[PDB]
Amino acid sequence: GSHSMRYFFTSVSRPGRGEPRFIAVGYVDDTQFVRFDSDAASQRMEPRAPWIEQEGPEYWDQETRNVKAQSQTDRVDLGTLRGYYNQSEAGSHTIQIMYGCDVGSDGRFLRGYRQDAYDGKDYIALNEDLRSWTAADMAAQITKRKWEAAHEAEQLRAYLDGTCVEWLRRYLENGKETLQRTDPPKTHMTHHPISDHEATLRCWALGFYPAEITLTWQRDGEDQTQDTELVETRPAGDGTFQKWAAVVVPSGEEQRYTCHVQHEGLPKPLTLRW
């Protein structure tokens, strides 16, 4: 029952049109709570979940400045990778940064992680030990060299078991009412025949939290790893999630197939069938 905070950063260029777009979003476990868009009217870091709103103007002042800081070391980097990669200055490009921290059930530091990408390609990532870096090509290999000099490895290690892990706890307490809840998936099955000799069994599940869930279609003990249709768990729009799985079944054998839902908020795996 561990918890995590993740900060998602994305920078996309627009040659000529104007300064590139910077969308930064933050996620505590699986709930979004802060937001920053270079294009919104505010020009300031914004709240999204209610329990962070209680923090005062000082929190919004620092947080706006430090995220405006990251926006800028990234405009520069958009162009710098334009150079390293020998790419035209007429094309739009995407840098994606992701980093975050893990705390255990009891508040301890577990692990921290940073991963960066260019145009959807793995670029550099922070290693296991938090003391080394890994470059994906010889172009990022030059960045790896520079960070090894100004010691971005150790001063970022300081952050991931310090400033993040504290404020993660504070985030888990200022909203423990709403971040610690475990909502169980409300399960039911539906049936729609496709032809005479054929029919479809689809096992649905709504309103669960967190999104980790497992729907497994088992025919008399057998996994339909080669016969089942599963969709991406999707957000309902309200802080809970939805996911469904379906299997193609011969018309008249809807009892041989069984569905199993295994979730954190479900006491024991439910096995539902026709």
**Residue numbering of the annotated binding site for a peptide antigen:** 7, 73, 84, 116, 143, 146, 159, 171
Helix (H) / strand (E) element for 188: namely strand 186-193
Q: Which residue, 47 or 265, has its beta carbon nearer to another protein?
A: 47
Rounded to a whole number of angstroms, the minimum distance from the CB of residue 264 to another protein is 20
Q: Which residue, 159 or 274, has its beta carbon nearer to another protein?
A: 159
Q: Which residue, 66 or 180, has its beta carbon nearer to another protein?
A: 66
Q: Which residue, 16 or 267, has its beta carbon nearer to another protein?
A: 16
Rounded to a whole number of angstroms, the minimum distance from the CB of residue 72 to another protein is 4
Breaks in the chain after (C-N > 2.5 angstroms): none
Residues 24, 8: Cα–Cα separation, whole Å: 6
Q: Tell me the sheet residues that pair with 217.
A: 259
Q: Which residue, 67 or 261, has its beta carbon nearer to another protein?
A: 67
The burial of 70, by beta-carbon neighbours within 10 Å (0-12 exposed, 13-18 middle, 19 or more buried), is given as: middle
Rounded to a whole number of angstroms, the minimum distance from the CB of residue 36 to another protein is 9
Rounded to a whole number of angstroms, the minimum distance from the CB of residue 274 to another protein is 17
Residues 250, 117: Cα–Cα separation, whole Å: 46
Say if CB 48 and CB 175 are below 8 A apart. Answer: no
191-197 CB contacts, 8 Å cutoff, 24+ apart? 191/254, 191/274, 193/251, 195/251, 196/251, 197/250, 197/251
Residue 138: strand, helix, or coil? helix
Interface with another protein (CB under 8 A): 7-8, 10, 12, 23-27, 32, 35, 37, 45, 48, 58, 61-63, 65-67, 69-70, 72-73, 75-77, 79-81, 92, 94, 96, 98-99, 117, 119-122, 142-143, 146-147, 149-150, 152, 155-156, 159, 163-164, 167, 190, 192, 206, 231-232, 234-238, 242
Of residues 138, 177, 133, the one with CA closest to residue 157: 133
Rounded to a whole number of angstroms, the minimum distance from the CB of residue 157 to another protein is 12
Neighbours of 176 (CB within 10 A): 11
Q: Which residue, 40 or 180, has its beta carbon nearer to another protein?
A: 40
Of residues 181, 239, 164, 159, the one with CA closest to residue 206: 239
**Which residues belong to the annotated binding site?**
7, 73, 84, 116, 143, 146, 159, 171
Rounded to a whole number of angstroms, the minimum distance from the CB of residue 168 to another protein is 9
